Amino acid sequence: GRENLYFQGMVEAFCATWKLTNSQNFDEYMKALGVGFATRQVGNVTKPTVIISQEGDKVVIRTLSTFKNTEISFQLGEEFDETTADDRNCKSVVSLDGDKLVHIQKWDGKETNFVREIKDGKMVMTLTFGDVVAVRHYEKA
Numbered sequence: 001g002r003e004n005l006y007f008q009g010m011v012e013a014f015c016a017t018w019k020l021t022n023s024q025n026f027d028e029y030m031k032a033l034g035v036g037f038a039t040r041q042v043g044n045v046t047k048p049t050v051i052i053s054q055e056g057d058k059v060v061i062r063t064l065s066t067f068k069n070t071e072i073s074f075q076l077g078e079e080f081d082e083t084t085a086d087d088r089n090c091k092s093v094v095s096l097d098g099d100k101l102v103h104i105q106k107w108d109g110k111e112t113n114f115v116r117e118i119k120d121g122k123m124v125m126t127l128t129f130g131d132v133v134a135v136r137h138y139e140k141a
């Protein structure tokens with residue numbers, strides 16, 4: 001009933017081609033993660049395209065850039081293995097929390113999370129590691 005209407009309407013809102021339009025404190029966020037000088041210099045100029053789609057029962061997230069191209073495929077709320085763009089081998093869970101799509105990565109006893117939300121048609125991504133928070137805005141292409 002309302003459960004399937006919530007899950008279908010939420011996933012539908014996020015499924016699009018998203019272009020990065022704005023970044024805030026992403027450099028600090030990469031520094032808190034332990035991303036070195038070399039990669040950070042690339043990461044601060046790289047303009048990603050994020051494609052979110054439904055491929056069967058799975059939700060797919062493709063991050064396309066001149067640095068590295070990543071692709072993750074998952075069932076909502078079911079843990080999966082993920083090798084990140086900065087070569088961290090995580091145990092990750094992508095889930096729904098109200099109007100938010102929450103991505104939690106765990107590796108080496110550490111934890112980082114990315115919260116994606118739709119705000120006035122834009123996708124706002126909040127990246128958190130400890131006290132360090134970054135905000136990235138995306139628009140539909």
Ligand SMILES: O=C(O)C(F)(F)OC(F)(F)C(F)(F)OC(F)(F)C(F)(F)OC(F)(F)C(F)(F)C(F)(F)C(F)(F)F
Nearest residue numbers: 030035039042043044046048050063065067084085086
């Ligand atoms: O979603 C996006 O648009 C995202 F590409 F920027 O990825 C991300 F969501 F920000 C991340 F959280 F995945 O980033 C990261 F965690 F992988 C990272 F911070 F390590 O990123 C990184 F360092 F690898 C990087 F070099 F900056 C990078 F070039 F891959 C990029 F694309 F993220 F900027």
